[PDB]
Amino acid sequence: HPAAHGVLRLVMELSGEMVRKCDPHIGLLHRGTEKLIEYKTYLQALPYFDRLDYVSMMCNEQAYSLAVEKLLNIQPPPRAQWIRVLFGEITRLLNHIMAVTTHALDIGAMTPFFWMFEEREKMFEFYERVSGARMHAAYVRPGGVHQDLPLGLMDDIYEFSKNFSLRIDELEEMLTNNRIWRNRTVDIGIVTAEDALNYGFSGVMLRGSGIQWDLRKTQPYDVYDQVEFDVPIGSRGDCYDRYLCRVEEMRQSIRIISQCLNKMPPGEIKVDDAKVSPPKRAEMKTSMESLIHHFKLYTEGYQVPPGATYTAIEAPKGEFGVYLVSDGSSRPYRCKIKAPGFAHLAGLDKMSKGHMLADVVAIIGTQDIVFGEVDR
Amino acid sequence: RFIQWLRNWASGRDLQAKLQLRYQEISKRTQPPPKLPVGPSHKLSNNYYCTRDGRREAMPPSIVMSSSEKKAVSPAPPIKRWELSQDEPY
Amino acid sequence: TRPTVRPRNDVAHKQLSAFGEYVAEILPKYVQQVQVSCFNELEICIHPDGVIPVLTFLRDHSNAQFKSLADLTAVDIPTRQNRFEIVYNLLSLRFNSRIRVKTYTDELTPIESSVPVYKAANWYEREIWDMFGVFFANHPDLRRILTDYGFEGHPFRKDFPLSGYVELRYDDEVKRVVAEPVELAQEFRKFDLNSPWEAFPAYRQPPE
Amino acid sequence: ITVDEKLDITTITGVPEEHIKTRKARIFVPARNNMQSGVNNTKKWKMEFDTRERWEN
Amino acid sequence: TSVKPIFSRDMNEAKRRVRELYRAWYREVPNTVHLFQLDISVKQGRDKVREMFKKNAHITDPRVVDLLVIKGKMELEETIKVWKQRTHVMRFFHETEAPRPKDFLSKFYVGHDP
Amino acid sequence: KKTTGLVGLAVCETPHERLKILYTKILDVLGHIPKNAAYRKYTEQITNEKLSMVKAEPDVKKLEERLQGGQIEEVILQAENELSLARKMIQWKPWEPLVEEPPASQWKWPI
Amino acid sequence: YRKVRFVGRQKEVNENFAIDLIAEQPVSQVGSRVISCDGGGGALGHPRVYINLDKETKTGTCGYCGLQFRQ
Amino acid sequence: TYKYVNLREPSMDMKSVTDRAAQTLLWTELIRGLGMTLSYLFREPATINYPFEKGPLSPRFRGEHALRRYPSGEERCIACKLCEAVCPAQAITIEAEPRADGSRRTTRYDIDMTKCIYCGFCQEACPVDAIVEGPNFEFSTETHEELLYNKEKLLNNGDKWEAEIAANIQADYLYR
Amino acid sequence: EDNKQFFGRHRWVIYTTEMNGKNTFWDVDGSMVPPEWHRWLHCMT
Numbered sequence A: 001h002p003a004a005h006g007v008l009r010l011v012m013e014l015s016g017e018m019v020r021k022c023d024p025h026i027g028l029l030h031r032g033t034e035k036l037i038e039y040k041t042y043l044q045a046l047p048y049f050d051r052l053d054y055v056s057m058m059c060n061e062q063a064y065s066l067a068v069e070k071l072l073n074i075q076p077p078p079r080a081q082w083i084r085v086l087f088g089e090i091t092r093l094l095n096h097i098m099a100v101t102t103h104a105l106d107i108g109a110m111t112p113f114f115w116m117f118e119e120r121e122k123m124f125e126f127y128e129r130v131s132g133a134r135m136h137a138a139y140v141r142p143g144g145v146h147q148d149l150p151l152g153l154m155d156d157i158y159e160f161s162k163n164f165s166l167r168i169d170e171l172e173e174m175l176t177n178n179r180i181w182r183n184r185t186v187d188i189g190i191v192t193a194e195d196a197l198n199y200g201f202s203g204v205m206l207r208g209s210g211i212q213w214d215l216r217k218t219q220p221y222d223v224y225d226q227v228e229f230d231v232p233i234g235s236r237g238d239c240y241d242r243y244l245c246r247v248e249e250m251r252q253s254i255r256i257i258s259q260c261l262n263k264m265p266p267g268e269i270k271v272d273d274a275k276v277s278p279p280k281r282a283e284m285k286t287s288m289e290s291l292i293h294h295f296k297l298y299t300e301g302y303q304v305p306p307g308a309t310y311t312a313i314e315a316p317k318g319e320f321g322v323y324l325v326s327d328g329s330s331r332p333y334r335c336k337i338k339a340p341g342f343a344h345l346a347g348l349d350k351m352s353k354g355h356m357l358a359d360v361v362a363i364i365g366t367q368d369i370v371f372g373e374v375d376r
Numbered sequence B: 001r002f003i004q005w006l007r008n009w010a011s012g013r014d015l016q017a018k019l020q021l022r023y024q025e026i027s028k029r030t031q032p033p034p035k036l037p038v039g040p041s042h043k044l045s046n047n048y049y050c051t052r053d054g055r056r057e058a059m060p061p062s063i064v065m066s067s068s069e070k071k072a073v074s075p076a077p078p079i080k081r082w083e084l085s086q087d088e089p090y
Numbered sequence C: 001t002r003p004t005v006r007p008r009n010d011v012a013h014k015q016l017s018a019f020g021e022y023v024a025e026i027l028p029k030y031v032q033q034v035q036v037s038c039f040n041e042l043e044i045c046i047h048p049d050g051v052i053p054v055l056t057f058l059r060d061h062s063n064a065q066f067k068s069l070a071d072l073t074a075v076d077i078p079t080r081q082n083r084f085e086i087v088y089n090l091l092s093l094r095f096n097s098r099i100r101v102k103t104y105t106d107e108l109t110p111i112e113s114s115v116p117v118y119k120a121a122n123w124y125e126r127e128i129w130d131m132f133g134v135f136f137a138n139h140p141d142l143r144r145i146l147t148d149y150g151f152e153g154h155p156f157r158k159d160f161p162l163s164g165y166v167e168l169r170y171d172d173e174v175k176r177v178v179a180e181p182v183e184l185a186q187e188f189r190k191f192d193l194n195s196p197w198e199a200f201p202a203y204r205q206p207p208e
Numbered sequence D: 001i002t003v004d005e006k007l008d009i010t011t012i013t014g015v016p017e018e019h020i021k022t023r024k025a026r027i028f029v030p031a032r033n034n035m036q037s038g039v040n041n042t043k044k045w046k047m048e049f050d051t052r053e054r055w056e057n
Numbered sequence E: 001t002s003v004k005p006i007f008s009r010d011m012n013e014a015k016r017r018v019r020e021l022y023r024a025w026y027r028e029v030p031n032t033v034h035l036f037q038l039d040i041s042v043k044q045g046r047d048k049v050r051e052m053f054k055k056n057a058h059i060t061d062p063r064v065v066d067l068l069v070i071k072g073k074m075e076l077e078e079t080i081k082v083w084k085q086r087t088h089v090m091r092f093f094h095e096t097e098a099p100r101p102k103d104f105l106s107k108f109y110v111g112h113d114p
Numbered sequence F: 001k002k003t004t005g006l007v008g009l010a011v012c013e014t015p016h017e018r019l020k021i022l023y024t025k026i027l028d029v030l031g032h033i034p035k036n037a038a039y040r041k042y043t044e045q046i047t048n049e050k051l052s053m054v055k056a057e058p059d060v061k062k063l064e065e066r067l068q069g070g071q072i073e074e075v076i077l078q079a080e081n082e083l084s085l086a087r088k089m090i091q092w093k094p095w096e097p098l099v100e101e102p103p104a105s106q107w108k109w110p111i
Numbered sequence G: 001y002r003k004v005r006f007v008g009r010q011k012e013v014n015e016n017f018a019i020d021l022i023a024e025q026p027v028s029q030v031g032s033r034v035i036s037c038d039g040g041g042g043a044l045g046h047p048r049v050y051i052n053l054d055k056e057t058k059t060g061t062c063g064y065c066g067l068q069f070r071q
Numbered sequence H: 001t002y003k004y005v006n007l008r009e010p011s012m013d014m015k016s017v018t019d020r021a022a023q024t025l026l027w028t029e030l031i032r033g034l035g036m037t038l039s040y041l042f043r044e045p046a047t048i049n050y051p052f053e054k055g056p057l058s059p060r061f062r063g064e065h066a067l068r069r070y071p072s073g074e075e076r077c078i079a080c081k082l083c084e085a086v087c088p089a090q091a092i093t094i095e096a097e098p099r100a101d102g103s104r105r106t107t108r109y110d111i112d113m114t115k116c117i118y119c120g121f122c123q124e125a126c127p128v129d130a131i132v133e134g135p136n137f138e139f140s141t142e143t144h145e146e147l148l149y150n151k152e153k154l155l156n157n158g159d160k161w162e163a164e165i166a167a168n169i170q171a172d173y174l175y176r
Numbered sequence I: 001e002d003n004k005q006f007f008g009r010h011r012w013v014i015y016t017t018e019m020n021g022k023n024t025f026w027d028v029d030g031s032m033v034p035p036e037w038h039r040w041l042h043c044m045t
């Protein structure tokens, strides 16, 4: 049961009580990815970035679509980006609704799950109305957003947001100062060291531990610069101060979704230059030039110049890489993805030696380890 | 009634934000036909490819490779710290 | 050009010329090439000798911190005559920059572990032994991660035909779940996308 | 340093199975599909193996 | 060729090595053969070990003979422990797979052009 | 101050002379390296200019600016290790010229 | 040999056929030289293609469209 | 900027420390929420009573496939071999061969319904606008010998409802 | 169809008997609805 929506088999040699040893076996979900993305073109191979993790959807692909526009020397048009903040910062309300709960289903409670997922539904519509599908939805592209959003959603985002800070106040009176929970987590799995850096951890289990750095305001993304927010920080390096980021980090988002509904300027959506964007269905269907760039654009891909990149983002649980070589022609060469799960679980064996076994179930939950991602 | 404020005896009171939205205050359908504009240098008589040019940009500029009052130049200036950001920062 | 074309920024490209000028200055026993990626990133071509050495200089200093190791990886190139490649990737928390360190190799020549320098190359080195076959000596542990217990081929290199050599299927003639050679139900069609005319003049290969 | 020069013609064994000695690879310059005049599909010496039976399912 | 060798130096310490871990295999085949509750004639388990070590015989070089070892040195980790469940082991001895002809005229009636 | 800030550290204790031990300790040891390789020409040049700022002003707070470290207690651990390289730096020998240029066509990217 | 698979399974097959369902159309006429074939309604249908009917009696229905067309 | 959370100190005075010793020992907290915030059961349940009632969707939904035909039918597909070549999963399989009159059409068209990953890449590459993901989740048969489709399974499955399909596109086609 | 006093349980349906070569009643699946109401009962429009 304690698989955390994933599959792992870990083996410990405990000393009579204390664990003092752990050495997990990952590699149950491997599936053979990066050997199969040398064989697909650029726009054809997009989803296999969406299907990597199960929870954050538009926050992936925001980290691929930003690792391609570079090699192309092209930026989206202004109404592109100000979408990618509204969905980009709405799925930080997903992994923070999950990692406070389906973590705390291990601690044994019931309602903080059956109480929330009433709501995590009211969001899944907003993936379905905008484009198609229940979870994995392929929307972002190399050219900015796919197609415009209907007449609506801005009375279904606003009406939904002003209701929400209450539900996050039913996960507080139900958790923070409830003792039997405070005692299940304090001073548990403390890594305060400069090994907590030396391992190269990403965001939280950093920012909740002191050392202070974030990739949203030290680097711009896509206009992220023009909205104001404050990055919560923790006191002592234990778990219950890596929880308390993930409440005060759900009460920052509703600032931005509220700050980002006021600014969205009218404008096109796709990149304009049309060699990298398909045309509409009014244009490809009458004039001439609008096939030969719609009919060579759906067999081979773009032509994206050679030379290597790297890039990074802040995904709800930590960074996300793409190290994208490209050989100078249509199909890629290594596309090497890194997500946490080579750090946040590199550091279990270290972190937990000297506490019981019935802690090690509640240590994992704070890293937010979610697998098939360790397809890294 | 006797069950209305016994829902209001706990969790403060709400009666406005309520879980099921099931009642009214929603969006109806897509009634109107929309029209999506095409702005960004879509016109004629001027827009000319080879000024818009998204791609065709050079190879990575080299630096001295095989075959001086340096201040110990760092890659960039060091970071200045953050504020404490009045919100209720404690 | 402005509206759809990514606006550049010069300042970032002046300094990472300098700060990388002189790490070919103070460790010339090792570093054999350096350059500046047009997007403001650096690539330091380093002989395979210095690996533990160079990082250790990058490990601490007051002019270059580079404490955070982010991404170790590899690339495997035939017709490079020394097959594989490493690429280390390191973030220096104070100075806000990325500087990547490229070191070549072969299969037979060992490379030496980085593990005492950073403790986060513990896993990333166990993996590569599985995939490409590079053998890292003096590594506190060397084992099999990401792969099953049967793969004797080291897949991600360029000689492994995509579908591996043994499909699996269970039969009730005894108990077990046993392994019979791979027999597909569809060819895996091979399309052919590579179009002529050389659309890129700048990258034009030498005239020859 | 243990430089230890020697000469043994490099070969490697055991990773594939019987496909070592059964087959014959081939090294050839692609010929330019002639329905079009683009000369850029040349210039790299690839290799590709023998073809064995495809049947019907 | 100038590159540092791995463990051995030339062929002797090397061919002391292959002699060595043989016994770790030869001394432990059978403790497993009761442990997995797999049933075979324990002498089979001593034929295969000696069937494999005689296989790669033509190796002319150090750093090859050290390379193979680093594989062989591993397996004794998994097998002497239980990281396999019966079905990563028995795959060595292929029970189900119908025989290959390997002769001539037996081919010519079945299969095209091997 | 009672909070070390970035956690994992602890404030003990002496400022203004705790650095001065180490820079001085750096400067003396550092001189034993031959003088050709610029390593001394840099590794020292940052320390002296650093030390000029150290001597002298209160409070420790205004020692922070113009010397960009983290908090002072951390700047020690910045100055702590820069030694632990130097006293290796003579073990292996960077200054010596370059060895084994790669086989003359290797780094050329589009194959 | 093959035919024993759909035994009792009733074998879905296509009641109508378009192999020719076309010829029942009142093949149109214009009184002009070249025409616009955009079919099935504006912006749902084949891309606009102009065909010449000058033969004697024939037309040409563009081959996307199929619908028998002439003067 | 910043914030600091879980940085506070107890007050340490006898007006307070009763308030924390009227808590441990009398349970004045821990009955605050789960004596209450649990009940709070008196809200109307939220359930879509399934075999009858059903939930929302949108005109852009994805699902079971179809092949339309114009008014009097042409089998709108021209076999231009595209919806085949953008397919990530490579489900599609197409074999044309010139039909008797000389207008081209298909013979074999097979969407495997296990491999198809539900992109929305085969709805968006067809220039003559044939192949269309239906909005019907009718599925789930009991034999994998089945879900593979032929041509002449599709057309019906796409002529069973064209009153569903032909009225969605004319909501949605004005956006793209 | 309810009075527009609910959302998502406001629109509902009733099955009766033996549509097409069918078992009588207590067999009800939900693929039976006429291929029109998919534009109504599902709240697509």
Ligand SMILES: CCCCCCCCCCCCCCCCCC(=O)OC[C@H](COP(=O)(O)OCCN)OC(=O)CCCCCCCCCCCCCCCCC
Residues within 6 Å of the ligand: A179, A182, A183, H024, H025, H026
């Ligand atoms: C002159 C006449 C005499 C005058 C006397 C004046 C009054 C004295 C009588 C007081 C005695 C009341 C009962 C005894 C005290 C309660 C038991 C207790 O001491 O709990 C202490 C417990 C320890 O917690 P702690 O020390 O903080 O350590 C954890 C730190 N992480 O801290 C805790 O909070 C534990 C809480 C209980 C643990 C289980 C709770 C689970 C939920 C069950 C609650 C339901 C019970 C409600 C009662 C129903 C009655 C019908």
Ligand code: SF4
Residues within 6 Å of the ligand: H076, H077, H078, H079, H080, H081, H082, H083, H084, H125, H126, H127, H128, H129, H130, H131
């Ligand atoms: S629908 Fe479009 S793609 Fe599918 S076959 Fe007919 S034409 Fe080719």
Ligand code: SF4
Residues within 6 Å of the ligand: H086, H087, H088, H089, H090, H091, H092, H115, H116, H117, H118, H119, H120, H121, H122, H123
């Ligand atoms: S549906 Fe998705 S998967 Fe099936 S063919 Fe069309 S695109 Fe390829």
Ligand SMILES: [Zn+2]
Residues within 6 Å of the ligand: G037, G038, G039, G046, G061, G062, G064, G065, G066, G067
């Ligand atoms: Zn027509």
